[PDB]
């Protein structure tokens, strides 16, 4: 309702980067928020793509952005009769960025990684790999929990169990507040996916430069399957985390596998030892149900709800006619050991093409009526198809089928507006939260003030 | 605190087999490769084999592939080293060994078990 | 095999002297070194991991250095606790080996 759409403040990148394919904001230890941006198409130093991550400090007029320095040489390590290869170009690096506490955690999905011992070899293959970072003290470290040292042959012999070679680590990324990063790796276990978990001092505290493979003792893998419903789900294309079991002291897992069931989609509410607590099941096949994830309590009970986009869902019109829309779904949870039910409120795109519900942020109390808000984004909405992004006001009886208001893109087509976004932080000391959007194709964010 | 502790000492016969073991504390056995190490006055530290308790695949130094067969159980989180056809020259101290961060390291030891091979 | 050549067999030092154990390698191990510490009738203590890292605990007078064929452990500022031996393993190359140690004895 209170966004301010006049007065903009435009962040930007280098032309082809993907400058605000992922975002978050970060506090400093003093308190002072700032705007990371990922953008996976950076030139490198050696004009080969890379990506890269900027930390933006706030300003009204905007600007460009200082350079979050990240280690983009390849690394050879032969140890044990075996070599170890690290391949960082085409990573992706600032596919996903996410900020916890002074540490900001940057992810290569596609970085490849491969070990070759005599004439054979693990394969050349996308684990993927997260950096972190820790900018008042430049201390730098690394996850990468998809790397092995196992050659080809023996996965054959094995039908190819616990295969982890094309993870995509770090494909999404949340942290908890304890501090565990838990990854998303849609790849996983032969593209079944899988989540990887663990505490983020444990990774600075157990990382050494140069090792290429070592052990984070304190890490937790999701399992392998051999039922076909899970073939090829990408469980873990977007993960989130919340409370849904009523006890405070454990954290609950929400995980997106929109292609879950021969594409019918998927997403699961899981304990942390990824026992399944709740599924949630796509309405129509091939909607990309999973895509978008969110929590947030919208109704002012304390109870975290979820929120769920099927970005591809086409919506019935007349004549038998369907038109590729976007919707998203929202749970409301109940009281007790009780299960999430069926929706309490579908929201459906209007714009062909749209995509509407392809990202979902909560916006914390933008308002400050007393419930919790979202935006959700259309990268493709509007008369014009320059993208949009919707707010929704938060009720008592969960939020309104009409959104309290319309963001329209400032950037030209194919910017894909709101394609990222990210609220529930005040970035201008106003008391009111604010809401940054990210424009990839247009290498640029957007940064909206709530204002009274 | 990781803490590997290995079974007491051993008196056994030429020609005899023997299994010593090894077993886990504050943390699982399949978590990372484990080694085993024989060590004597004279000869000193000679590398026998690992085993990755995951999956149960060794490695072996030569010298050893015959008399020596390293196994793990991830039921009891135990590892172990089983010697055949005993000699004097297999009258020794044994270790289980395994790394800190770095998969390939040797970083934690057991207390060592001591074999004496006599008639 | 790789061959592990570490000298002196044994030094007779004092409290508070630095001291250095060096290891030659019979090929180019890239740092694929660790340094052991067996105390007097105790088991082993590992002190570095690839060449120059500390396992966690080791004192910081215990430093590791070299490259290639050619490595160093050096104790700076001697303790009573750091008369024992002292042993480098290579692990480049399955089977790992070992030097052959280092005594450091007290000198009078």
């Known amino acids: 309702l209170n966004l301010d759409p006049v007065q903009l403040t435009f962040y930007a990148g280098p032309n082809g980067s993907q400058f605000g394919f992922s975002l978050d904001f970060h506090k400093d230890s003093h308190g002072r928020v700032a705007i990371v941006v990922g953008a996976p198409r950076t030139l490198g130093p050696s004009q080969e793509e890379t990506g890269g991550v900027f930390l933006c400090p706030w300003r009204a007029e905007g600007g460009q952005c200082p350079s979050l320095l990240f280690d983009l040489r390849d690394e050879t390590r032969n140890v044990g009769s075996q070599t170890l290869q690290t391949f960082k170009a085409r990573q992706g690096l600032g596919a996903s960025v996410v900020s916890w506490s002074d540490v900001i955690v940057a992810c290569a999905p596609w970085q490849h990684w491969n070990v070759l011992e005599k004439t054979e070899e693990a394969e050349k293959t996308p684990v993927g790999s997260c950096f972190l970072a820790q900018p008042e003290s430049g201390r730098r470290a690394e996850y990468s929990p998809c790397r092995g040292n196992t050659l080809s042959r023996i996965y054959v012999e094995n039908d190819f169990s616990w295969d982890k070679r094309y993870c995509e680590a770090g494909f999404s990324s949340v942290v908890t507040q304890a501090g565990e990063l838990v990854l998303g790796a849609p790849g996983g276990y032969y593209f079944l996916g899988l989540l990887a978990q663990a505490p983020v001092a444990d990774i600075f505290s157990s990382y050494r430069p140069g090792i290429l493979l070592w052990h984070v003792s304190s890490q937790s893998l999701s399992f392998d399957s051999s039922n076909p419903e899970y073939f090829d789900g990408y469980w873990g294309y977007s993960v989130a985390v919340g409370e849904f079991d009523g006890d405070l002291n454990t954290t609950e897992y929400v995980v997106g596998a929109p292609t879950w069931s021969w594409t019918l989609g998927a997403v699961e509410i899981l304990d942390s030892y990824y026992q399944r607590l709740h599924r949630l099941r796509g309405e129509q096949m091939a909607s990309y149900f999973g895509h978008s994830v969110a929590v947030t309590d919208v109704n002012g009970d304390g109870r975290h709800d979820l929120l769920v986009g099927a970005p591809l869902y086409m919506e019935s019109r007349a004549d038998r006619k369907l038109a590729e829309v976007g919707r998203v779904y929202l749970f409301l949870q109940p009281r007790g050991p009780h299960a999430l039910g069926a929706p309490s409120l579908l929201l459906t795109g209007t714009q062909l093409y749209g995509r509407f519900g392809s990202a979902i942020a909560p916006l914390g109390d933008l308002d400050r009526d007393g419930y919790n808000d979202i935006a959700v984004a259309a990268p493709y909405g509007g008369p014009s198809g320059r993208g949009q992004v919707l707010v929704f006001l938060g009720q008592s009886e969960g939020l309104r089928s009409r959104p309290s208001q319309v963001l329209d893109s400032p950037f030209p087509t194919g910017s894909a507006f709101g394609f990222s976004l990210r609220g529930a932080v005040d970035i201008d000391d106003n008391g009111y939260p604010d809401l940054i959007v990210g424009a990839y194709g247009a290498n640029q964010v957007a940064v909206y003030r709530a204002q009274p | 605190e990781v803490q590997l502790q290995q079974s007491g000492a051993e008196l056994v016969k030429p020609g005899a087999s023997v299994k010593l073991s090894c077993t886990a504390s504050?943390?699982?056995?399949?978590?990372?490769?484990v080694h085993w190490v024989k060590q004597r006055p004279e000869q000193g530290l000679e590398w026998i084999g690992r085993?990755?308790?995951?999956?149960?695949?060794?490695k072996y130094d030569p010298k050893f592939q015959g008399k020596a067969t390293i196994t793990a159980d991830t039921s009891s989180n135990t590892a172990y080293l089983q010697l055949s056809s005993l000699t004097s020259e297999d009258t020794a101290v044994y270790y289980c060994?395994?790394?800190?961060?770095?998969?390939?390291?040797?970083?934690?030891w057991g207390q060592g078990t001591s074999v004496t091979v006599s008639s | 095999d790789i061959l592990m050549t570490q000298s002196p067999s044994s030094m007779s030092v004092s409290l508070g002297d630095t001291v250095s154990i060096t290891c030659h390698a019979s090929?180019?191990?890239?740092?694929?070194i660790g340094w052991l510490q067996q105390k007097p009738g105790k088991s082993f203590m590992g002190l570095i991991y690839?060449?120059?890292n500390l396992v966690d605990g080791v004192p910081s007078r215990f430093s590791g250095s070299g490259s290639g064929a050619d490595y160093s452990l050096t104790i700076s500022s001697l303790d009573s606790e750091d008369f024992a031996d002292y042993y480098c393993?290579?692990?480049?190359?399955?089977?790992?080996?070992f030097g052959g140690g280092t005594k450091l004895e007290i000198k009078r």
């Open positions: 085993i990755d308790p995951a999956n149960g695949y060794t």
């Open positions: 060994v395994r790394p800190l961060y770095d998969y390939y390291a040797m970083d934690y």
């Open positions: 690839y060449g120059t």
């Open positions: 090929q180019g191990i890239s740092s694929n």
């Open positions: 393993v290579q692990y480049a190359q399955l089977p790992y080996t």
């Open positions: 504050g943390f699982n056995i399949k978590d990372t490769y």
